[PDB]
Amino acid sequence: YHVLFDSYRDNIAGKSFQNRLCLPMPIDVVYTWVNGTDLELLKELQQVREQMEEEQKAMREILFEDNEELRYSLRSIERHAPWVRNIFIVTNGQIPSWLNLDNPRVTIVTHQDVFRNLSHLPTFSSPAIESHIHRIEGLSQKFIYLNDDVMFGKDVWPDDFYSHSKGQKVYLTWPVLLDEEESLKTQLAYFTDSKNRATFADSLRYVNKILNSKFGFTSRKVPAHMPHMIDRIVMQELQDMFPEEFDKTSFHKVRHSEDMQFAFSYFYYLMSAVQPLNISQVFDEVDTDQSGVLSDREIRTLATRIHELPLSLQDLTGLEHMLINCSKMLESYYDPNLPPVTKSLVTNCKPVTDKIHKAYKDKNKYRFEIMGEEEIAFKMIRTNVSHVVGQLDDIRKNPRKFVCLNDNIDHNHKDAQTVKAVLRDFYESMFPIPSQFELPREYRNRFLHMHELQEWRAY
Amino acid sequence: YHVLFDSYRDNIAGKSFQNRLCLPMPIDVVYTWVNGTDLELLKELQQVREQMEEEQKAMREILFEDNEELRYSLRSIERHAPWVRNIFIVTNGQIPSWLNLDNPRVTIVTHQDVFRNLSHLPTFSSPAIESHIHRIEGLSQKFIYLNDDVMFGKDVWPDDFYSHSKGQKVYLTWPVLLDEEESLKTQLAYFTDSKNRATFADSLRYVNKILNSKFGFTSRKVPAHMPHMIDRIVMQELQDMFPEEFDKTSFHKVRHSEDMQFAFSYFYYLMSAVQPLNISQVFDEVDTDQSGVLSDREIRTLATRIHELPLSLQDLTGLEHMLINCSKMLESYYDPNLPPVTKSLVTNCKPVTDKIHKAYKDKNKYRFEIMGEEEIAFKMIRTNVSHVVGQLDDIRKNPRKFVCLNDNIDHNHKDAQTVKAVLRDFYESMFPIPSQFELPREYRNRFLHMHELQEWRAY
Numbered sequence: 001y002h003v004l005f006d007s008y009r010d011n012i013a014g015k016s017f018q019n020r021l022c023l024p025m026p027i028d029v030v031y032t033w034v035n036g037t038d039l040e041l042l043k044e045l046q047q048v049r050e051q052m053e054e055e056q057k058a059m060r061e062i063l064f065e066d067n068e069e070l071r072y073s074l075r076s077i078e079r080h081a082p083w084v085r086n087i088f089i090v091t092n093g094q095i096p097s098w099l100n101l102d103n104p105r106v107t108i109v110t111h112q113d114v115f116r117n118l119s120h121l122p123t124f125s126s127p128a129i130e131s132h133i134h135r136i137e138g139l140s141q142k143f144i145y146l147n148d149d150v151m152f153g154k155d156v157w158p159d160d161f162y163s164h165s166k167g168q169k170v171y172l173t174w175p176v177l178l179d180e181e182e183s184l185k186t187q188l189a190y191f192t193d194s195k196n197r198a199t200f201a202d203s204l205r206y207v208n209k210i211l212n213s214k215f216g217f218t219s220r221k222v223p224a225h226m227p228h229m230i231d232r233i234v235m236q237e238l239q240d241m242f243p244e245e246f247d248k249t250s251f252h253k254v255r256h257s258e259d260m261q262f263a264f265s266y267f268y269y270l271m272s273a274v275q276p277l278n279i280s281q282v283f284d285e286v287d288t289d290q291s292g293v294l295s296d297r298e299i300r301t302l303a304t305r306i307h308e309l310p311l312s313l314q315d316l317t318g319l320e321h322m323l324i325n326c327s328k329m330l331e332s333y334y335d336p337n338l339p340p341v342t343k344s345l346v347t348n349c350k351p352v353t354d355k356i357h358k359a360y361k362d363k364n365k366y367r368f369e370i371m372g373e374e375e376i377a378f379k380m381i382r383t384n385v386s387h388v389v390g391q392l393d394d395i396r397k398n399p400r401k402f403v404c405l406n407d408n409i410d411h412n413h414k415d416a417q418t419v420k421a422v423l424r425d426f427y428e429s430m431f432p433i434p435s436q437f438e439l440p441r442e443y444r445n446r447f448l449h450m451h452e453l454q455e456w457r458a459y
Numbered sequence: 460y461h462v463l464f465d466s467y468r469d470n471i472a473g474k475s476f477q478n479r480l481c482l483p484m485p486i487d488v489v490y491t492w493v494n495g496t497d498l499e500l501l502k503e504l505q506q507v508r509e510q511m512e513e514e515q516k517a518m519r520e521i522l523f524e525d526n527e528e529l530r531y532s533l534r535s536i537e538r539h540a541p542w543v544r545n546i547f548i549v550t551n552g553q554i555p556s557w558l559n560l561d562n563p564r565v566t567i568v569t570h571q572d573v574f575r576n577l578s579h580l581p582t583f584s585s586p587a588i589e590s591h592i593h594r595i596e597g598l599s600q601k602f603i604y605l606n607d608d609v610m611f612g613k614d615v616w617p618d619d620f621y622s623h624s625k626g627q628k629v630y631l632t633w634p635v636l637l638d639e640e641e642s643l644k645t646q647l648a649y650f651t652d653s654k655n656r657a658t659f660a661d662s663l664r665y666v667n668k669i670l671n672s673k674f675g676f677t678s679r680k681v682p683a684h685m686p687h688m689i690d691r692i693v694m695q696e697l698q699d700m701f702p703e704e705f706d707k708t709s710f711h712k713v714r715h716s717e718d719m720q721f722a723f724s725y726f727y728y729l730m731s732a733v734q735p736l737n738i739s740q741v742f743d744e745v746d747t748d749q750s751g752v753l754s755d756r757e758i759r760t761l762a763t764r765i766h767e768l769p770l771s772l773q774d775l776t777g778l779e780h781m782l783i784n785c786s787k788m789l790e791s792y793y794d795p796n797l798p799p800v801t802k803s804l805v806t807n808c809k810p811v812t813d814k815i816h817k818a819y820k821d822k823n824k825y826r827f828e829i830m831g832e833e834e835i836a837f838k839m840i841r842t843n844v845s846h847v848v849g850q851l852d853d854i855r856k857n858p859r860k861f862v863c864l865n866d867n868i869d870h871n872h873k874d875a876q877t878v879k880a881v882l883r884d885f886y887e888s889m890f891p892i893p894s895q896f897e898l899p900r901e902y903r904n905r906f907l908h909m910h911e912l913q914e915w916r917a918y
């Protein structure tokens with residue numbers, strides 16, 4: 001209504017402060033989903049053949065099952081984060097079977113639009129897709145990146161990702177010829193478990209080395225595995241910031257030890273971005289009259305803010321002498337011979353600008369906030385029924401706003417189906433209600449409810 | 460426009476989240492101003508006579524200058540905090556000479572409306588007025604209290620006073636017959652310097668004793684002297700919380716060692732307010748289906764959240780036995796004899812509620828946040844020109860969002876007019892532009908500009 005619109009201009013100034021009080025909206029969600037269809041594995045095996053023959057030429061020259069985390073993640077988005085405008089899922093050519101494509105708020109974005117060099121679409125590597133979300137048509141300036149296996153809880157709000165006062169919120173964790181032989185080593189670890197999508201520590205070390213070479217030496221931690229808020233403008237600045245470095249990440253059809261991630265690279269560039277000093281900004285903020293001419297009080301506050309306290313009169317006299325020097329080379333003051341101090345006089349006197357730069361050291365271009373792992377759930381699910389049930393009960397007793405469960409099950413064990421059933425039971429317990437993004441389905445499905453009962457009986 | 464209104468319902472849920480994303484508005488400002496007119500001092504002296512004669516009967520039975528802080532504070536409100544809707548000034552009967560009463564956004568509220576028992580209006584004591592701001596007609600639910608001597612800076616925003624996630628922001632500082640003889644002592648310290656308005660540590664100790672008696676023993680700090688955000692609902696709850704205790708503060712016509720303040724009392728009640736446990740809330744949050752009946756997963760999460768991890772099967776079996784006990788006294792489960800678990804069954808089984816209370820201990824009714832003195836300026840201005848100029852230069856070099864300058868000048872010294880001139884110079888330097896609340900005035904005033912120059916020459 002018009003009353004609501006006019007209520008925001010009812011302050012003393014009479015202006016509007018929507019951009020400072022009502023948080024940055026809209027905010028979108030981006031998912032990276034993949035499926036283990038027969039065509040995907042066939043492309044995988046031919047790519048293995050190509051890489052093997054490439055290595056063969058190199059030393060000749062020298063001479064599966066997914067327990068539906070996307071469904072429950074979308075349910076979590078609907079339940080705890082109902083302020084999301086649009087949800088995007090990036091896939092090669094696969095469309096989720098149970099997603100309701102008729103819903104305008106969910107869209108499948110193929111790799112054709114995501115990638116710009118159409119010769120890299122059969123990439124089959126998560127960092128390559130991670131490097132190019134911000135180029136999606138219709139994406140908001142600020143969006144959250146979801147890794148298809150992280151869920152929400154405790155009614156998460158955008159206040160937990162970005163704040164207008166302290167900037168973005170950064171969550172950190174534990175601190176971080178012959179090349180053909182190294183490439184020969186990389187062909188052994190291709191099938192570890194990570195082609196299930198969405199070799200890691202080495203890449204982190206490479207990014208640390210690059211940032212160290214450009215931003216200087218600093219002890220760096222790694223971001224937590226949790227839904228990350230990404231700014232399109234900042235990410236694009238990072239893209240042009242290392243043009244050829246991002247090419248290598250997109251060029252590789254295998255996640256290589258030499259590439260840069262989505263969170264470590266984006267966040268630490270945000271924390272280390274240096275903005276050049278603006279002399280005009282200094283003059284404007286010091287000049288409270290906005291008249292362009294400084295009085296004795298403005299000169300005094302300049303001297304205090306340039307020099308170091310305590311301020312002796314010699315500092316102010318020297319600053320005045322420096323100011324009168326420049327005028328000869330190029331509302332009454334105490335010193336009769338001191339000319340009017342305008343922006344041009346202070347921005348053209350080289351030693352004065354040098355002292356200003358000495359006082360105004362390099363600031364940070366973007367604000368940021370740092371927090372620990374008191375609100376992030378990262379649990380390890382490895383083939384042990386007792387450990388899994390204990391961890392899930394720990395989740396249940398104390399909910400956290402960011403929940404991650406790595407599904408690297410052995411898949412060849414007597415206690416794999418039971419663990420899968422327990423995980424499905426936990427996911428359905430957290431979020432039973434079907435989401436709006438799900439096609440009408442799951443009729444008379446009756447997933448195994450006795451395996452959970454079986455481990456209850458065993459324990 | 461209608462597009463702006465409809466944009467807030469463009470999320471997945473389709474609802475509106477104005478009350479959670481756009482901060483609590485409107486927010487008002489309340490000033491406590493007083494002037495040293497001849498009538499005020501005449502009432503002061505007759506009150507001194509009454510108190511002296513009261514003490515005389517007691518042991519018979521046994522047998523000035525203000526340097527315009529309100530102007531610059533209003534200028535600071537306009538410059539750095541332009542989001543304030545209304546500004547209120549509470550005075551006995553005095554109206555500031557230079558205030559523009561034609562401005563609808565500034566209003567003078569007399570003590571008649573502030574006080575409810577019309578027999579206490581000649582109170583002449585700051586805590587008495589402090590106890591009754593929240594009863595002002597037209598005041599917002601959340602407002603900032605200004606002590607007529609605290610200014611703003613660095614473009615303060617409501618984010619620095621209250622946050623929707625962490626609640627209100629609390630700023631703390633350094634940790635905290637025969638009665639007729641004590642009353643005889645109190646008559647000596649009546650004129651110290653504090654009848655200039657807007658005996659202090661003893662009152663803090665009294666409030667600490669009251670809170671200790673009611674909220675238990677806890678090490679308590681004192682709030683900083685800075686513009687405090689006060690909630691009308693919380694303050695009213697505190698008013699009814701100690702009905703007769705607040706009477707003594709309002710009854711006294713002298714700020715007595717036995718009374719309770721505006722910040723220490725309000726804040727620590729906010730930090731210690733205990734809300735009784737709601738069993739219905741527990742049942743609702745545990746029941747994710749909202750169907751009113753709990754399944755095996757809901758029972759399991761109840762057991763995990765009531766008992767202590769690790770959860771043995773004996774705990775769950777005991778909880779189930781307890782549940783089936785109550786039904787006899789008053790979607791298939793694993794135990795065939797376990798009746799459907801509704802809200803009534805769990806809220807009527809006494810031992811289950813006892814265990815829930817044991818797990819769900821007493822929570823805090825209101826959220827709060829704690830910060831230090833890294834953004835509050837409290838400087839001491841005592842008759843020393845060098846100390847004053849050093850402190851003011853320290854203010855200038857590093858601005859802070861909350862600036863306080865106590866004007867307890869000796870007023871009988873060779874260096875009092877110089878200090879007053881330096882203070883006026885600093886205030887005009889920070890905020891030269893006249894505010895909208897000032898009547899057109901200050902023509903050809905030409906306040907002394909040579910005393911600052913005089914101390915420049917001396918130094």
Ligand SMILES: *[C@@H]1O[C@H](CO)[C@@H](O[C@@H]2O[C@H](CO)[C@@H](O)[C@H](O)[C@H]2NC(C)=O)[C@H](O)[C@H]1NC(C)=O
Nearest residue numbers: 034035036037038039064066094095096097098
């Ligand atoms: C993921 O891939 C599976 C195959 O790996 C696909 O599921 C097939 O769906 C078709 C229907 O078009 C059935 O005829 C096949 O029997 C299914 N295969 C299997 C192994 O069940 C589908 O592309 C994706 N399925 C899901 C659930 O995401």
Ligand SMILES: *[C@@H]1O[C@H](CO)[C@@H](O[C@@H]2O[C@H](CO)[C@@H](O)[C@H](O)[C@H]2NC(C)=O)[C@H](O)[C@H]1NC(C)=O
Nearest residue numbers: 382383384385386387388389390391415768769
């Ligand atoms: C699965 O995890 C459980 C813990 O939940 C393991 O139980 C531990 O067993 C060792 C020795 O067998 C004991 O010293 C520990 O005290 C047990 N843990 C607890 C919490 O009591 C169990 O061994 C794990 N199973 C496998 C196959 O590793």
Ligand SMILES: *[C@@H]1O[C@H](CO)[C@@H](O[C@@H]2O[C@H](CO)[C@@H](O)[C@H](O)[C@H]2NC(C)=O)[C@H](O)[C@H]1NC(C)=O
Nearest residue numbers: 493494495496497498523525553554555556557
């Ligand atoms: C504060 O009190 C002073 C007196 O203590 C008042 O100023 C007087 O204003 C009248 C005009 O109505 C003059 O005729 C008097 O000469 C003033 N007195 C003095 C001592 O200057 C007034 O009530 C208040 N003044 C201010 C500036 O707030």
Ligand SMILES: *[C@@H]1O[C@H](CO)[C@@H](O[C@@H]2O[C@H](CO)[C@@H](O)[C@H](O)[C@H]2NC(C)=O)[C@H](O)[C@H]1NC(C)=O
Nearest residue numbers: 309310841842843844845846847848849850874
């Ligand atoms: C006013 O404050 C200044 C400090 O700004 C005092 O100067 C100090 O004087 C003592 C001895 O006289 C020295 O030991 C200190 O080093 C001085 N301070 C500084 C910062 O150098 C001055 O004494 C004060 N004046 C009065 C009357 O107390």
Ligand SMILES: *[C@@H]1O[C@H](CO)[C@@H](O)[C@H](O)[C@H]1NC(C)=O
Nearest residue numbers: 116117118119120250251252
């Ligand atoms: C990227 O595209 C350019 C032409 O636009 C092409 O020359 C280059 O080889 C491509 N990169 C590849 C194929 O890795």
Ligand SMILES: *[C@@H]1O[C@H](CO)[C@@H](O)[C@H](O)[C@H]1NC(C)=O
Nearest residue numbers: 277278279280281282284285
């Ligand atoms: C920063 O500098 C640019 C040009 O150097 C100027 O246009 C801009 O107004 C400055 N920003 C300020 C004064 O805030």
Ligand SMILES: *[C@@H]1O[C@H](CO)[C@@H](O)[C@H](O)[C@H]1NC(C)=O
Nearest residue numbers: 317318319321322324325326
């Ligand atoms: C520049 O200023 C200094 C004082 O800081 C003065 O001694 C010197 O003579 C000035 N330069 C010229 C060319 O006058």
Ligand SMILES: *[C@@H]1O[C@H](CO)[C@@H](O)[C@H](O)[C@H]1NC(C)=O
Nearest residue numbers: 575576577578579709710711
């Ligand atoms: C407050 O008002 C009541 C009546 O409303 C009166 O009895 C009482 O004496 C008053 N308190 C005083 C005068 O301190």
Ligand SMILES: *[C@@H]1O[C@H](CO)[C@@H](O)[C@H](O)[C@H]1NC(C)=O
Nearest residue numbers: 736737738739740741743744
């Ligand atoms: C708290 O309890 C009251 C009654 O005891 C109930 O009306 C209210 O809905 C409860 N709050 C919840 C369930 O959030």
Ligand SMILES: *[C@@H]1O[C@H](CO)[C@@H](O)[C@H](O)[C@H]1NC(C)=O
Nearest residue numbers: 776777778780781783784785
């Ligand atoms: C209550 O439950 C306990 C098991 O915890 C059981 O031993 C007892 O018999 C029950 N009470 C009655 C009256 O049956």
